[PDB]
Write a protein that binds this ligand. Structure first.
Ligand SMILES: C[C@@H](O)[C@H](NC(=O)c1ccc(C#CC#Cc2ccc(N)cc2)cc1)C(=O)NO
Ligand SMILES: C#Cc1ccc(C(=O)N[C@H](C(=O)N=O)[C@@H](C)O)cc1
Ligand SMILES: [Zn+2]
Length: 300
């Protein structure tokens, strides 16, 4: 039987929050079967839980956030969420003593190492996958995202960049998901932003944790970071990282074919909710036989 996974041990790390510019302490904790992914703010007292749920997502100006019944938020969850998906973590409690997850280097890679530190513990309970049964498509102008039936997990992402620093040769990325493929091809791709916009935000007391150490920054013409890009197509790779984090907001790995054009957080979430809302368009599947498990979802 393919089993659910959690952490072996409690681990913690520290890093600046993109919004506040303050030091945030991140604590990752093991959790029992079926409890899922729970984000928790411990700056608030009493602390507040935010179960990762498609319906609870909001696409904020910076990154994304989860909200509770009272519109209290926890922000910047998507990069860590992508790492959870990558390593197949099903149940976990994620605590921060702040309103946001630390931005780290702008990618998911630092969370990969943190999760490795915590170890993977298999629980005696079947891991549930969301298998796509019908083609489901959502749109927003010329933008669209869709899921199609497919025995595995593929992502086909096209971005509609018009910036001098992004060549047409790097407008699209497509991959067969797997823990190894996520870790090596995707996890190190950093988020990015436009310097003038960031300047404005900081002039308004926002995005205070922003720095060259946590993002690719371009002006009108070029990448400003001294060392340049980690990949020639780092921008689109990060947008796929973001797609993986968005889709994992349901707390389950998906068996299907993901394809999107000019998609973002809002549209990715719109697709996720559209699929889950349509009873006929999907079903939970488990694998009592480990052999039946598709290639993409094998352990690292
Ligand atoms: C790409 C988007 O989808 C989205 N990214 C963000 O919204 C985002 C917003 C701002 C920054 C930044 C910065 C900075 C700085 C800086 C550099 C140098 C100096 N001297 C001073 C400040 C980075 C990402 C995302 O990835 N969601 O998952
Ligand atoms: C706050 C805030 C949020 C978004 C923007 C914005 O859309 N910036 C425009 C831009 O082109 N950015 O790349 C500018 C350059 O027109 C500006 C301010
Ligand atoms: Zn991102």
């Amino acid at each position: 039987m393919i089993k659910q996974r959690t952490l072996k041990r409690i681990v913690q790390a520290t890093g600046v929050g993109l919004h506040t510019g303050k030091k945030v302490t991140l604590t990752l904790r093991p959790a029992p079967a079926n409890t899922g992914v729970i984000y928790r703010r411990t700056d608030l007292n009493p602390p507040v839980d935010f179960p990762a749920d498609a319906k609870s997502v909001r696409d904020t100006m910076l990154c994304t956030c989860l909200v509770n019944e009272h519109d209290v938020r926890i922000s910047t969850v998507e990069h860590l969420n992508a790492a959870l998906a990558g390593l197949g973590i099903d149940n976990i409690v994620i605590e921060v003593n702040a309103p946001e997850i630390p931005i780290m280097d702008g990618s998911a890679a630092p969370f990969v190492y943190l999760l490795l530190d915590a170890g993977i513990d298999e629980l005696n309970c079947a891991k549930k996958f969301v298998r796509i049964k019908e083609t489901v498509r959502v749109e927003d102008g010329d933008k669209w995202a869709e899921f199609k039936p497919y025995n595995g997990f593929s992502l086909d992402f096209t971005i509609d960049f018009n910036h001098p620093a992004i060549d047409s040769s790097n407008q699209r990325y497509a991959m067969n998901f797997s823990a190894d493929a996520f870790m090596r091809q995707i996890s190190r791709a950093r988020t990015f932003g436009f310097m003038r916009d960031i300047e404005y935000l900081q002039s308004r007391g926002l995005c205070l944790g922003g720095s060259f150490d946590c993002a690719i920054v371009v002006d009108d013409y070029r990448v400003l970071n001294e060392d340049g890009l980690r990949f020639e197509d780092e921008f689109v790779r990060h947008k796929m990282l973001d797609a993986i984090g968005d889709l994992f907001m349901c707390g389950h790995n998906i068996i299907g074919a993901f394809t999107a054009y000019k998609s973002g957080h809002a549209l990715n979430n719109k697709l996720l909710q559209a699929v889950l809302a349509k009873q006929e368009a999907w079903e939970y599947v488990t694998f009592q036989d480990d052999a039946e498990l598709p290639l993409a979802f094998k352990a690292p």
